[PDB]
């Protein structure tokens, strides 16, 4: 039960969830960057096809 209330499971699981949340944040950032690169390359290809 730990001291001053709280529970050990509560904090362990909250920290595990925070770790998974940060993993998702990192993967979200990098996938967003990949989407930006795809937009750039696709605009280039379509403009060249128009020409």
Partner 1 sequence: AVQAVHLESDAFLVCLNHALSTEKEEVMGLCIGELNDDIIRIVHIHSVIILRRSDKRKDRVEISPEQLSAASTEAERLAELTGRPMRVVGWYHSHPHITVWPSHVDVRTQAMYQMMDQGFVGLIFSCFIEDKNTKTGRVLYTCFQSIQAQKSSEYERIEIPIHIVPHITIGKVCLESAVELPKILCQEEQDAYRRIHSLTHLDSVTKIHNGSVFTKNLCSQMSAVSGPLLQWLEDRLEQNQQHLQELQQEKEELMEELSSLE
Partner 2 sequence: ALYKPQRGLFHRVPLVVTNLGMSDQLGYKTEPASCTSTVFSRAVRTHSSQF
Pair 7, 1: CB distance under 8 Å: yes
Does residue 4 touch partner 1 according to CB under 8 A? Answer: no
By CB under 8 A, name the one of 2, 7, 10, 19 that touches partner 2: 19
The CA-based diameter of the chain, rounded to the nearest angstrom, is: 72
By CB under 8 A, name the one of 7, 10, 16, 28 that touches partner 2: 16
Does residue 44 touch partner 2 according to CB under 8 A? Answer: no
Residue length of the chain: 51
> For residues 47 and 51, what is the distance between their CA atoms, to the nearest angstrom?
6
| Contact footprint for partner 2 (CB under 8 A) | 8-9, 12, 15-16, 19-20, 23, 27
């Amino acid at each position: 039960f730990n001291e001053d209330g709280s529970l050990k499971e509560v904090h362990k699981i909250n920290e595990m969830y925070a770790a998974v949340q940060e993993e998702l944040k990192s993967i979200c950032q990098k996938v967003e960057q990949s989407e930006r690169e795809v937009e750039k390359l696709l605009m280039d290809v379509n403009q060249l096809k128009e020409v």
